[PDB]
Symmetry: D2
Subunit: 334 residues, 4 copies
């Protein structure tokens, strides 16, 4: 039996999580809450996508409900998360994806509405973080509020886990070249505390600070205090790339690194970590469900103890599919 | 003596109007009001521009005032326009540029603060409209609230005036290919009543409805009910182009049209309407102060009574310079 | 029995024609000629596409042949079209898509190699032009060299045919907003006779002259001398739009135009002319196989005799699918 | 007395070198050779620029000569560099900028035409390399063929020189995020030996291999074998950024690094290496003449021996100004 999932917020992450849930069939969506989008606008927003194309299926509105592939979905319009009746709609798990309730106390308001477990699709200050394929076996059913970290952490963590297991990362610095997001502006406009992010996204790349490489040390406890980095935001649509420059404890030629990464991508991390040797570019990874894909031909090594590794990730489809996979594993553990 | 000007709102139009005022020297800026931008952020926003480059001069903050080229400017942070003390700062004219006070009643709240005349840098439902070089001689000193129409109206009106004076436009339809603005979104996001405008600006052109060609009939009364059109919003930075397809009462070869447009651009409409015969593109008109520049080589004529005319305009610098010119003419009429 | 097709040139049009042929299954590709692309580079170029995504199927190289979905394809590397042995490979029809052999004499060199009929996927000065759904019933088996006009002609001709059949177009002018093509440059570079086309495609829109609206009069003989127009080349990837401003002989409200266009798109022109009433943008028509899709909400009418109609087209997939459909009809007529 | 300079090739580098020479006034241009551009097309190409705007001055053609600011320039159309009469035009130095004569033997053909010294504006396999402000004092008048390395080497070398002089770089890896160049394609097209570079520049970032960090070891001999790296090519117009991840022999806090970089940018490396602490983006460095500008706020340090440094560079204006400065120093050494 599939678990029943409600979604709070119909932004980019909520719509793509609903799309991934209906495409994979692992979980069932029964309720969506958004206070600023009405039903017909939800139909229009779900049906058409500039990046991932039209939805393969039927979506319509009937009797005040959103019907996707013949499945009706209840729609709520509450602005206070403590007043949403999740239990009346039958939702067992709730995906919090608005990005403003990230603490345990703020995201715990969904438990008052009748939900059982809450999954935060964002980095959290105090909720435990789980990344699929890295530390998701440490989950137990006593935990009620779960965080899934972010897209950059989900790209960096499996590759760093493989490299640290085989060669012992001593210290590393990460640079990610990121696509544009919803928090940026088309022209030069006002941004409150981040002055670089208010500049025009079409004409410039923004060197942005990120905390994903530090969160890898929270997901992998042996790498705590050994990773940090920054970001650049280039005017491109969807696909981002992580560049990790690291120092290794044991000697490692580049062919050995390629061999162990390919071996990990075949058996244990299948569907999470990818491997390729072709002359790929960014748009070759559009609508790819992998967390990260190792680029063998793009990296370079200075010597046996100082390497630079390149990994591609779709920061839209991969993260949503990992949210669905985490919910499926959580339902299986019950 | 130059007139004293206050600016309400430090958005794109307000900053570019301040830049044009300090570059041309026709008017003097003494006060700026914005409730969401503090002083140091005003210094940063005025100093750096992605489109028009760095400011040629000195800008700094001292004693709670914005000093530009040695000239101090008082800063207000009021959110209610009736409580701004324009008379204490010495501001005689006030440019309303926030885009939310466009009616006569809403924009008349600046008169309670001590201002003499208010100029709206937007289309208005009930305030009189004036376009420089077309109908600006109809202004008199009894009028207190003035509208300057928009950038597309300021591009279309002088060319339509010349063509109607020489050949008698019977009917016309306008298509403008517009650059991206601040109301658009980088990715697919929510827009309230305009569903097409919420889609991603980097990946698609939006067929948007505009009322500029109808407002030309309000500026030129003989063309009332003979012009309408639409718009496209392509992913480009700054320069837009107007394509006017019209039918003429009298026969007109294309060389005669070129001759009368060049003659008008030399003597009477100098600095407002431009003329070129070179193989120009859009970025050749970056930071151009003309209202419109007629492209001789780009247009086409089917016969002697059915022509298509092409005109370029910078919808950022040209409109701000026209606001400054209108204020200078208003001060001269006193 | 499907007809056997050879393709000369593996550029954008040749690769997309091969993709459309394998996706639809109407014709069979048996031979490809290109003097500058070797076999493994053909595999790489066919497998990956930045615009239309990865190929849904298997493509590989074996025994000096290109195997697509289990079908082997002979590869030629000749630079002279008279020396290609089309008859040895079994190719009955030949698609000439290099863009340099467009006259009847130059494209007739493929007949010496053993081909039966040659189809030019470009406008031609002397070869007869056929557009599917408009004048393709005028083809007979005595003709050997056929032209399929271009993408803009294939978008404009069915809509103009419907409007002229129902209301009598008197005169019209067309503006198309076109996506970037392979003849443009990334930065400012040298172009021989077209100085505007040598400028940077990412930063500017080029007002380009086109002959598609004049070629509509060659496809529809009653509209000869009544249509002409120009073009703009905006920095976007794939989808273009045609704006037709026309004058009608009989009175026509906009609802009547919508009714007759929807009626034509249902029955007779099904799959060629589309109809929509949704709030669509350009990326909603990516990988769409229609020749043209009428946008009901985007157009505008000044009065009963002067209208402006908007039509979307994918200038990559639609034209290739029309080439395949024309070849299927030509094979059926034998 | 200013030295007389001829330019071979009127591509991007040649036009920008001519523009920098006329803007700075250090050298005098007397002759330009290009076999594919005629005189009026040279006037059009020099007058208009999409990136750097219109030329501030007068440019025209008279008597078969290119007159810039009242200075006449002889035009040659030879395709063989041994047949260009540089001595008849009076050119003493010759800038070879076509990018196809980079060896000493191929670039020595200009000496047969009457030139004295040849400067290659590209990396060279056997000609000596000089970077202004780093090793340009090692030049002597016995040398006849000189290379100026590339834009990325000119950005990386002064910062690496300062950091190695103060703290002792042990090993380092460089990632540069580069703007698009003339060798890329607008859509997916054929590229011979570099399959990634043939993909569409507007829709994807290309991980490209570069040899600039290895050439730094040729310019600074103590860093030989300690630096290498790669590149990404994002769809942006003009400004690139270098990210250097290095390990230091002596302990260095980030404030000490900022102090020594600011001290070097003030006195010795004035005009070559810049320093800023503002919240800058890429378009803030458009038409900047510095070789590199250190970004203090964008970098990050993991500990006292492992840092990441960020430097901005205009890869068009800065390199051309360094070519002009190298020619001025070479003329002063005579």
């Amino acid at each position: 039996g599939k678990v029943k999932v409600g979604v709070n917020g119909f932004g980019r992450i909520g719509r793509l999580v609903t799309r991934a849930a209906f495409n994979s069939g692992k979980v069932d969506i029964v309720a969506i809450n958004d206070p600023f989008i009405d039903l017909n606008y939800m139909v229009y927003m779900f049906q058409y996508d500039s990046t991932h194309g039209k939805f393969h299926g039927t979506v319509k509105a009937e009797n005040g409900k959103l019907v996707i592939n013949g499945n009706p979905i209840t729609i709520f319009q509450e602005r206070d998360p403590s007043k949403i009746k999740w239990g009346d709609a039958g939702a067992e798990y709730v995906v919090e994806s608005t990005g403003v309730f990230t603490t345990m106390e703020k995201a715990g308001a969904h438990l008052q509405g009748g939900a059982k477990r809450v999954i935060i699709s964002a980095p959290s200050a105090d909720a435990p973080m789980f990344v699929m394929g890295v530390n998701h076996e440490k989950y137990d059913n006593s935990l009620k509020i779960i965080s899934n970290a972010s897209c950059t952490t989900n790209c960096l963590a499996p590759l760093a886990k493989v490299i640290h297991d085989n060669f012992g990362i001593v210290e590393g610095l990460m640079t990610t070249v990121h696509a544009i997001t919803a928090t940026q502006k088309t022209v030069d406009g006002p941004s409150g505390k981040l002055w670089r992010d208010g500049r025009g996204a079409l004409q410039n790349i923004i060197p942005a600070s990120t905390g994903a490489a530090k969160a890898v040390g929270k997901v992998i406890p042996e790498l705590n205090g050994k990773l940090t980095g920054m970001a650049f935001r280039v005017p491109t649509a969807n696909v981002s790339v992580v560049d990790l420059t690291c120092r290794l404890e044991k000697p490692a030629k580049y062919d050995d690194i390629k061999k162990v990464v390919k071996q990990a991508s075949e058996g244990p991390l299948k569907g999470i970590l990818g491997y390729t040797e072709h002359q790929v570019v960014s748009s070759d990874f559009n609508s790819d469900t992998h967390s990260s894909t190792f680029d063998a031909g793009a990296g370079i090594a200075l010597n046996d103890h100082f390497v630079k590794l390149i990994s591609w990730y779709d920061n839209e489809f991969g993260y949503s599919n990992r949210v669905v996979d985490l919910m499926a594993h959580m339902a299986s553990k019950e």
